[PDB]
Amino acid sequence: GFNLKVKDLNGSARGLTQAFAIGELKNQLSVGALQLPLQFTRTFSASMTSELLWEVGKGNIDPVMYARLFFQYAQAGGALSVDELVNQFTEYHQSTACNPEIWRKLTAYITGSSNRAIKADAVGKVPPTAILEQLRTLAPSEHELFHHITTDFVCHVLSPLGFILPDAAYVYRVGRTATYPNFYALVDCVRASDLRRMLTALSSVDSKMLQATFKAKGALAPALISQHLANAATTAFERSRGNFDANAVVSSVLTILGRLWSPSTPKELDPSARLRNTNGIDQLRSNLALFIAYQDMVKQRGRAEVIFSDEELSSTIIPWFIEAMSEVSPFKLRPINETTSYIGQTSAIDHMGQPSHVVVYEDWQFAKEITAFTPVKLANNSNQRFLDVEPGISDRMSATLAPIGNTFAVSAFVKNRTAVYEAVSQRGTVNSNGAEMTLGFPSVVERDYALDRDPMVAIAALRTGIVDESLEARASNDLKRSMFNYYAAVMHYAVAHNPEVVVSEHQGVAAEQGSLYLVWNVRTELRIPVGYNAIEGGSIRTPEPLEAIAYNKPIQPSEVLQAKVLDLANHTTSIHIWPWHEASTEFAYEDAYSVTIRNKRYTAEVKEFELLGLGQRRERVRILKPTVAHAIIQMWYSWFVEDDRTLAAARRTSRDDAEKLAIDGRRMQNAVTLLRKIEMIGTTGIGASAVHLAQSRIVDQMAGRGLIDDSSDLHVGINRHRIRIWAGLAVLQMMGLLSRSEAEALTKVLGDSNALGMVV
Amino acid sequence: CNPEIWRKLTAYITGSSNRAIKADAVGKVPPTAILEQLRTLAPSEHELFHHITTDFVCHVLSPLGFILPDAAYVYRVGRTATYPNFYALVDCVRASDLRRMLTALSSVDSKMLQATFKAKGALAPALISQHLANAATTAFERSRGNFDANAVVSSVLTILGRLWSPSTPKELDPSARLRNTNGIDQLRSNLALFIAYQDMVKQRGRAEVIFSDEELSSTIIPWFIEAMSEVSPFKLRPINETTSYIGQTSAIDHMGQPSHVVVYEDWQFAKEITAFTPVKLANNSNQRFLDVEPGISDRMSATLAPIGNTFAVSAFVKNRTAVYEAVSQRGTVNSNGAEMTLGFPSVVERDYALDRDPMVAIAALRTGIVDESLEARASNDLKRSMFN
């Protein structure tokens, strides 16, 4: 729901300038006339709208799945980086799998003794679960993943089918992932691929015959295999060497695509026609994701250096950079046309006419369900849980959910956003300071609501283009990353609609090298109110993807991009679980409605379960945070408050008496629309149940403390609408939809301009 | 559903955590011993749970070899609140959810567990740990939450509210098909279900339907009836025979109109008062033998007989009517009219049972207002009593 003034970008939003992204913060902006062309066919983007449950087998040790999960773990909530996540695994795996001490202890626990060895046609089957039970005390690992990966390794090598009962069911949730590939995120793909080879090393053609060597002619003596497997797990490990640094893979490969993007390729080295012939590099130089990534890297690094095992090596080794990008990563490769299918664009207009107001949007579908579950622990000290989804609460909320999606729909949003911008006696204009641009991108917003950060601080950073140096490392790192996701999504919609482009170098700050940037070309009408450009010939070259987008015409979105509920129901009811806690929420709500009647104040307090009409209260149940839905509402919220803020500063700065009568106009007008919206939700299964409980409790308080006859005032015009607005906000809050802190700053907005018409 | 736990207790009976032996030597094992383990394995507050799982295992464990069927365990079924508050109804539906839950555990397939391993004889133990785990899960996964118990009662009473009412609005009045559904005749004629409606709509302020009707609740559910028929302590009675313990008697003036009217429950006192000393068999559990030691019980019971004589309800109503008269008759509306007093020990006994002052409930009746400060369980016990 980010609004911006297109004329002055550096002022309006510094964060979305390409000028910012390549590292020029000076008054100077990219020079419109410079050199060399390009066309982007495809890109690397993650999936939207996907919540998937992945079982981890008996065995089977899927070397990609784990490498995929690791990413989801580092992503869906911060745990360091997926690079730092791997070298943690190596230390665990060395301290454990390579150490015969830990093997002696756990082989003794299974059967039959630590010292004595018996061929034992007697020994019966064993559960995989008890070994983890052993391992939690044996290898007090933070990330409970590791205990499975080692496990089903042993469960792979243990199957003559007697001793191993290959029965357990364990599942992990693959959720929404950040869409676009930050530089270190690429590094994170390569490091995720280091893992791919590692695990497909563990389960091997020789790991299957370790079983078959001891399958003949029957049972054999146990005490030994504690020392052999201990090194056998090292043999697959010592054989897989880190070799080439994943940081270095990406550092060098990017360096070269930038050398062949640039119009300046100096004397010494321009790419070999051999490496130019390498498969896929046709689709790589035409990949935009890689381009924004280059900008990212050279901005932070300030140089690009090469391993020089090329001209040969990276032509033969690696393409596997592609493999890292192709299989392991959530970033799987797409045609650039079909990546933006969820993005529309629409303008307001004047008579002639130029657009007064241009709105870029993502079509999103709300709902379907809101899941409510109660976790159950099977064994102590662990995150192992069955999640019983307890419905009828889930349903009850889902019912109240349906109308919200209706009244808050993005379709509904763009309507109420466009038809408002008109000013007195038309006609325009560049007056009022030109043509505003607003862009909702819930896909980006969802990341902040998932990582439990206030999205508004990121939005803040966009306008200013600076972050507070004070806040802790992990905090800014979450911010910067999210701040990238905006910029990225912009240049994808920006590029997808005008592929003909120019790459050009920069003077440089040091000057060391410089960053390569983009300029567009677009056909349009003659005379421009819009942000500075020549325009010279009805076509215009522009550096900033905003201006390039402003010159487009209305677009229909191809797909609805329906957000989906996770199925706890069919699976988890029988199965164990992932890192669920941070991604969900304790289910509790309290609120109170107060009012003054006849110079006396009454107050009712309400609890969450009273609102769903049940008793008494169940504290154990939790709700899965609906991170997406909040982001859509954010789009509305972010419009209401930020306009009100600037319009206040607009009315002060407006000297003209005719201009101010318009300003305070726009303020009251859309404020009632907001009121209309909330009041509507305030009438729902919950909302009236809320209003009823409230009023019910006030009167019983009015009977005791005095005469009841005063209750007539609760039914008065104003008090009747009052309780309704509150209930509306109160119902949104007791669902994942409204922060109490944002609703406070919402109500004040409803009160900063009087914003109550009695209106018969 | 947890196989680690099943392994642990199967190992605990005999003979080892790892090695599995058919073991025709192994003799029987006591159920009390399985519970001793369970107190450490699944530390629940309500010890009920440990028995219900227990005799599931003693049901699937009876080729009769391993289980020695020797124990004696007893529970006290005492006085219950008499009438079904709205939320008590929800509690009935929720209990029949448990009826189907358990009747799932003891099954035609839990019984073939006897018949599957009856062939051809004793078999290796390491197996049955994983078998039972899946056996109890199939019983669990088969009983699904299905219908929300609140939503059941909400909607079934709501439609009963629709055909009781003189206002049956334009939009929806019951289908004659569901109107014909068996038992709905005794449902619209059920008094408890009516005061329950009043209860519900007082708190809720509206009545909504699952809207699976017009069809569903004609076909599903009657099972509301099933929940109410079997499980519940509230079992269905003719309304003529429900008030059988209630008498009524009036004082009078000369003409005369009643001066004083007393409604009462005939109750008989005594006979005995038991005194016991609890003896613990095992620590950490509520398991006790209770040796009732008489000569105290007999001594008090001896003193109890005369209290019964002097306090019998009969003597109460006798001494109550004869007081109210005033000089030279005649009435009246003076003295503030004709008083009515009604004792209901059945109701008061609940408060003395729940360790509450009957007088605080009584006070709430006269005023009709409760203190909002006091804690949840406290008021909830009050309102529940205030309903009774």
Side-chain angles (χ1 to χ4, degrees), chain A residues 1-25 27-104 106-124 126-132 134-298 300-302 304-425 428-515 517-615 617-665 667-760, chain B residues 1-7 9-27 29-35 37-201 203-205 207-328 331-388:
Chain A
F2 181 103
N3 181 81
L4 79 105
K5 296 119 204 163
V6 74
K7 274 64 183 165
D8 181 14
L9 293 194
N10 286 266
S12 159
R14 170 87 56 73
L16 294 186
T17 48
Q18 185 161 171
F20 183 57
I22 65 102
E24 177 71 317
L25 36 82
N27 64 311
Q28 291 83 24
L29 62 345
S30 300
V31 162
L34 267 210
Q35 300 81 348
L36 181 149
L38 182 53
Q39 197 215 349
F40 297 98
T41 158
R42 299 181 170 83
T43 201
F44 284 113
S45 94
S47 192
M48 335 282 152
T49 183
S50 57
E51 310 280 304
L52 304 166
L53 293 195
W54 288 357
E55 170 177 13
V56 312
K58 37 184 191 177
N60 309 76
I61 327 155
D62 188 352
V64 58
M65 165 163 69
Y66 289 66
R68 177 65 87 83
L69 295 198
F70 272 64
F71 224 73
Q72 189 66 237
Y73 186 127
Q75 199 77 232
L80 285 303
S81 66
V82 99
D83 166 46
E84 173 67 7
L85 186 46
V86 138
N87 52 321
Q88 287 199 4
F89 179 100
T90 82
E91 293 178 31
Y92 158 91
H93 183 275
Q94 272 183 285
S95 173
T96 61
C98 312
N99 183 15
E101 192 258 12
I102 277 197
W103 277 99
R104 206 53 204 156
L106 45 73
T107 37
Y109 175 87
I110 62 96
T111 89
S113 188
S114 65
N115 55 1
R116 305 189 172 277
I118 303 90
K119 279 188 170 178
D121 193 71
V123 155
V126 172
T129 70
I131 91 98
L132 201 142
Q134 221 64 25
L135 264 169
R136 296 188 309 259
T137 52
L138 273 182
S141 115
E142 301 192 345
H143 328 286
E144 205 172 345
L145 262 303
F146 299 177
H147 297 135
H148 292 82
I149 182 171
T150 65
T151 294
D152 54 28
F153 152 64
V154 335
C155 299
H156 180 14
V157 308
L158 255 56
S159 335
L161 167 282
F163 354 101
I164 43 101
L165 59 87
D167 315 323
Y170 289 83
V171 88
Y172 203 106
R173 168 191 168 272
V174 181
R176 277 227 64 214
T177 314
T179 61
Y180 291 142
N182 156 48
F183 165 73
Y184 279 88
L186 291 181
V187 182
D188 272 20
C189 291
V190 185
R191 199 57 199 271
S193 73
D194 280 339
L195 180 55
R196 182 211 55 92
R197 83 187 158 173
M198 183 71 59
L199 310 186
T200 195
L202 254 289
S203 62
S204 34
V205 285
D206 317 356
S207 61
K208 282 214 165 157
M209 59 145 74
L210 197 263
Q211 315 199 67
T213 185
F214 300 159
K215 91 184 173 294
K217 69 221 184 49
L220 298 178
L224 189 145
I225 54 98
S226 282
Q227 182 68 70
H228 160 257
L229 282 210
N231 284 8
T234 311
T235 56
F237 162 77
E238 61 203 12
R239 174 184 293 264
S240 319
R241 306 177 58 169
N243 267 119
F244 315 105
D245 166 37
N247 169 90
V249 166
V250 178
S251 277
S252 45
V253 52
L254 280 188
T255 296
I256 81 105
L257 262 71
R259 285 205 276 251
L260 55 97
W261 276 330
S262 182
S264 291
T265 60
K267 311 191 255 148
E268 283 84 332
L269 222 39
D270 172 282
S272 172
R274 160 167 56 152
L275 48 83
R276 257 188 178 91
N277 163 278
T278 307
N279 301 290
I281 200 177
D282 50 21
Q283 269 198 32
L284 248 71
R285 62 176 302 171
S286 189
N287 189 288
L288 178 61
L290 274 36
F291 183 79
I292 59 189
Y294 181 104
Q295 296 184 315
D296 192 285
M297 161 179 168
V298 72
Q300 312 196 356
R301 298 285 193 78
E305 202 163 20
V306 220
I307 65 171
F308 198 59
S309 259
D310 290 307
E311 309 278 46
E312 199 211 12
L313 264 83
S314 188
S315 70
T316 162
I317 184 103
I318 30 66
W320 165 79
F321 186 42
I322 285 77
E323 178 54 19
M325 219 56 57
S326 79
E327 187 109 24
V328 186
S329 175
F331 291 71
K332 178 55 156 300
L333 183 62
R334 309 174 196 274
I336 207 166
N337 293 8
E338 297 184 339
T339 191
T340 63
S341 293
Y342 47 64
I343 316 267
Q345 185 170 338
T346 287
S347 289
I349 213 61
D350 66 65
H351 59 280
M352 287 174 64
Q354 293 89 10
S356 50
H357 204 63
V358 40
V359 38
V360 190
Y361 61 107
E362 307 181 339
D363 196 67
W364 272 97
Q365 201 174 323
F366 239 80
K368 40 188 187 180
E369 194 166 345
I370 286 312
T371 25
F373 66 106
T374 166
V376 176
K377 78 172 173 76
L378 47 117
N380 26 11
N381 84 39
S382 85
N383 209 249
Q384 279 169 119
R385 305 284 148 102
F386 301 78
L387 313 174
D388 169 21
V389 37
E390 274 175 341
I393 292 194
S394 339
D395 312 331
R396 206 70 49 95
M397 281 175 169
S398 303
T400 298
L401 185 289
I404 311 166
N406 285 34
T407 181
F408 288 100
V410 197
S411 195
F413 176 80
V414 286
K415 192 253 154 166
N416 293 322
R417 190 49 156 131
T418 40
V420 168
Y421 199 32
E422 295 87 63
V424 302
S425 59
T429 352
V430 192
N431 310 336
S432 270
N433 288 346
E436 284 179 342
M437 162 146 46
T438 173
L439 37 104
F441 278 147
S443 59
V444 189
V445 178
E446 184 272 347
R447 293 316 287 157
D448 284 27
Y449 279 145
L451 294 208
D452 298 311
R453 310 299 208 185
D454 187 19
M456 292 299 310
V457 77
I459 288 184
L462 292 192
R463 290 191 265 116
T464 169
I466 63 187
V467 317
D468 178 29
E469 51 275 35
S470 74
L471 51 109
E472 72 283 359
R474 67 179 320 185
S476 78
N477 280 7
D478 269 345
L479 159 84
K480 288 161 41 191
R481 293 310 175 246
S482 176
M483 194 161 57
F484 171 98
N485 287 273
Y486 275 143
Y487 177 95
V490 161
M491 284 194 69
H492 270 74
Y493 190 56
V495 147
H497 291 7
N498 303 100
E500 293 198 339
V501 287
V502 180
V503 184
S504 305
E505 248 200 10
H506 192 274
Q507 295 273 40
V509 280
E512 152 68 7
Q513 202 193 327
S515 205
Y517 64 82
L518 249 48
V519 346
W520 282 256
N521 276 277
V522 48
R523 292 179 297 140
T524 16
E525 60 70 44
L526 208 136
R527 278 146 198 142
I528 50 104
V530 289
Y532 60 52
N533 34 30
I535 54 166
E536 256 169 9
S539 51
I540 179 65
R541 315 189 273 271
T542 175
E544 299 298 344
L546 293 313
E547 271 183 11
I549 283 191
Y551 284 140
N552 301 133
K553 290 213 80 243
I555 314 295
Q556 195 68 28
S558 317
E559 291 311 318
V560 283
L561 202 50
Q562 139 93 30
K564 65 139 158 169
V565 74
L566 179 54
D567 166 22
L568 270 294
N570 217 330
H571 303 287
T572 293
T573 185
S574 175
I575 294 103
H576 298 184
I577 291 278
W578 85 96
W580 51 268
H581 196 296
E582 176 63 304
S584 59
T585 172
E586 179 187 359
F587 169 68
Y589 186 67
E590 288 192 8
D591 204 329
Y593 180 79
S594 305
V595 69
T596 53
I597 291 302
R598 304 278 222 244
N599 205 258
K600 298 186 68 66
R601 185 187 301 275
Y602 308 83
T603 299
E605 63 170 9
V606 79
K607 302 177 183 60
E608 71 284 330
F609 61 86
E610 308 187 327
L611 293 179
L612 303 193
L614 43 103
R617 172 196 187 112
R618 39 176 62 185
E619 61 280 345
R620 266 171 281 95
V621 309
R622 303 182 66 98
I623 260 60
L624 214 170
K625 283 186 295 186
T627 61
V628 35
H630 198 182
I632 298 165
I633 297 186
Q634 140 87 9
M635 193 188 49
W636 295 84
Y637 166 88
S638 49
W639 166 41
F640 280 135
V641 185
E642 199 61 56
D643 257 31
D644 188 79
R645 190 270 183 157
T646 60
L647 265 50
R651 189 180 60 180
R652 301 192 200 111
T653 45
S654 175
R655 260 179 180 287
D656 175 36
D657 209 7
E659 187 182 14
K660 289 174 86 172
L661 52 83
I663 302 181
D664 198 10
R667 285 193 57 169
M668 190 218 183
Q669 196 252 347
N670 60 10
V672 319
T673 63
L674 163 69
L675 202 161
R676 212 189 142 72
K677 287 317 190 59
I678 305 168
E679 179 153 348
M680 198 179 316
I681 327 163
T683 67
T684 28
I686 278 61
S689 182
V691 180
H692 177 269
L693 266 161
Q695 290 185 353
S696 184
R697 293 183 184 276
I698 284 182
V699 182
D700 259 330
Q701 209 167 117
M702 276 187 172
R705 272 102 184 281
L707 281 212
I708 306 91
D709 291 31
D710 300 28
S711 60
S712 55
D713 294 309
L714 298 183
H715 301 0
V716 87
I718 266 55
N719 296 334
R720 175 54 63 78
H721 286 1
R722 191 167 200 96
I723 186 94
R724 198 76 57 163
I725 300 184
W726 168 78
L729 292 198
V731 57
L732 265 47
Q733 288 184 2
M734 81 153 290
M735 309 182 76
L737 307 173
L738 268 196
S739 155
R740 190 186 286 249
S741 46
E742 66 202 352
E744 183 176 1
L746 201 60
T747 315
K748 291 335 181 105
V749 154
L750 198 47
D752 275 343
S753 48
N754 179 282
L756 290 88
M758 67 188 84
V759 201
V760 186
Chain B
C1 312
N2 184 15
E4 187 252 10
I5 285 195
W6 285 101
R7 204 50 205 153
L9 40 71
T10 35
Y12 179 86
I13 57 95
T14 83
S16 189
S17 64
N18 53 3
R19 305 189 174 277
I21 303 91
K22 279 189 170 179
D24 191 69
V26 155
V29 171
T32 75
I34 93 101
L35 205 142
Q37 218 63 27
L38 265 169
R39 296 188 306 257
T40 53
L41 273 181
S44 120
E45 300 189 344
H46 329 286
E47 203 172 344
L48 264 304
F49 293 172
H50 298 136
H51 288 81
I52 190 169
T53 67
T54 292
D55 56 28
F56 157 67
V57 335
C58 299
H59 178 12
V60 305
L61 255 52
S62 335
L64 170 283
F66 349 91
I67 43 102
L68 59 86
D70 321 325
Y73 288 79
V74 90
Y75 206 106
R76 169 190 169 272
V77 177
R79 276 225 63 216
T80 311
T82 60
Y83 298 148
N85 158 49
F86 163 77
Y87 277 114
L89 295 180
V90 192
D91 271 22
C92 291
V93 179
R94 200 61 206 275
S96 77
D97 281 339
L98 179 56
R99 178 209 50 89
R100 86 184 161 172
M101 182 83 62
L102 311 188
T103 199
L105 257 290
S106 60
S107 35
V108 285
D109 306 352
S110 58
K111 284 212 167 156
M112 61 149 80
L113 198 261
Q114 314 199 68
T116 184
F117 297 161
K118 91 184 173 294
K120 74 221 191 52
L123 301 178
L127 182 142
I128 60 100
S129 284
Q130 182 68 37
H131 167 265
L132 281 210
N134 282 8
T137 305
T138 56
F140 169 75
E141 64 201 13
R142 176 181 294 268
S143 319
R144 308 179 60 165
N146 268 294
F147 314 102
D148 170 36
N150 171 91
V152 164
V153 180
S154 279
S155 45
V156 50
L157 279 191
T158 290
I159 78 103
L160 262 68
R162 287 213 273 251
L163 54 96
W164 271 326
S165 181
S167 291
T168 55
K170 312 188 255 149
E171 284 85 330
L172 221 39
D173 173 282
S175 170
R177 164 166 56 146
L178 52 83
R179 252 194 176 93
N180 170 276
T181 307
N182 301 291
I184 202 178
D185 52 22
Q186 265 204 32
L187 252 70
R188 59 173 299 173
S189 187
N190 190 284
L191 175 60
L193 271 39
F194 184 80
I195 56 189
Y197 177 90
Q198 296 183 304
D199 188 89
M200 162 177 168
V201 74
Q203 312 194 356
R204 298 282 195 77
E208 201 167 19
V209 219
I210 70 173
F211 197 29
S212 263
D213 290 307
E214 305 276 43
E215 201 214 12
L216 265 83
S217 187
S218 71
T219 164
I220 190 103
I221 32 66
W223 173 81
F224 180 40
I225 284 78
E226 186 61 21
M228 211 53 58
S229 81
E230 190 108 24
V231 186
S232 172
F234 294 77
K235 180 56 158 301
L236 178 63
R237 305 176 195 273
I239 206 166
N240 294 8
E241 297 183 339
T242 191
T243 61
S244 295
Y245 47 67
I246 320 268
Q248 184 169 337
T249 288
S250 293
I252 213 62
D253 64 63
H254 57 283
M255 288 173 64
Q257 292 87 8
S259 48
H260 199 64
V261 40
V262 36
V263 187
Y264 68 107
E265 308 185 340
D266 196 68
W267 271 96
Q268 202 172 322
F269 239 79
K271 42 186 188 180
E272 195 168 346
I273 279 313
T274 29
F276 74 108
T277 161
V279 180
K280 78 171 177 77
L281 46 113
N283 28 12
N284 87 42
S285 86
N286 213 251
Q287 279 172 120
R288 309 286 148 102
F289 298 68
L290 317 175
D291 172 23
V292 37
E293 274 175 340
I296 286 194
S297 338
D298 310 332
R299 204 72 52 96
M300 283 177 171
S301 303
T303 294
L304 191 291
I307 307 166
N309 283 34
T310 177
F311 289 106
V313 209
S314 194
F316 178 81
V317 281
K318 193 254 154 166
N319 293 319
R320 190 51 160 135
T321 40
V323 169
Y324 200 28
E325 295 87 63
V327 303
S328 58
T332 352
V333 189
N334 309 337
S335 269
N336 300 347
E339 285 178 342
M340 161 149 47
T341 171
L342 38 101
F344 282 143
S346 60
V347 186
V348 176
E349 181 273 348
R350 294 314 285 156
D351 284 26
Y352 278 145
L354 292 207
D355 298 310
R356 310 300 206 185
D357 190 18
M359 292 300 308
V360 76
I362 289 184
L365 289 191
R366 295 215 272 118
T367 167
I369 64 189
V370 313
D371 179 29
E372 49 275 35
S373 72
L374 50 105
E375 68 285 0
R377 70 177 320 185
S379 79
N380 282 7
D381 265 343
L382 159 85
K383 287 163 44 188
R384 295 311 169 246
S385 175
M386 195 163 59
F387 165 96
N388 287 274

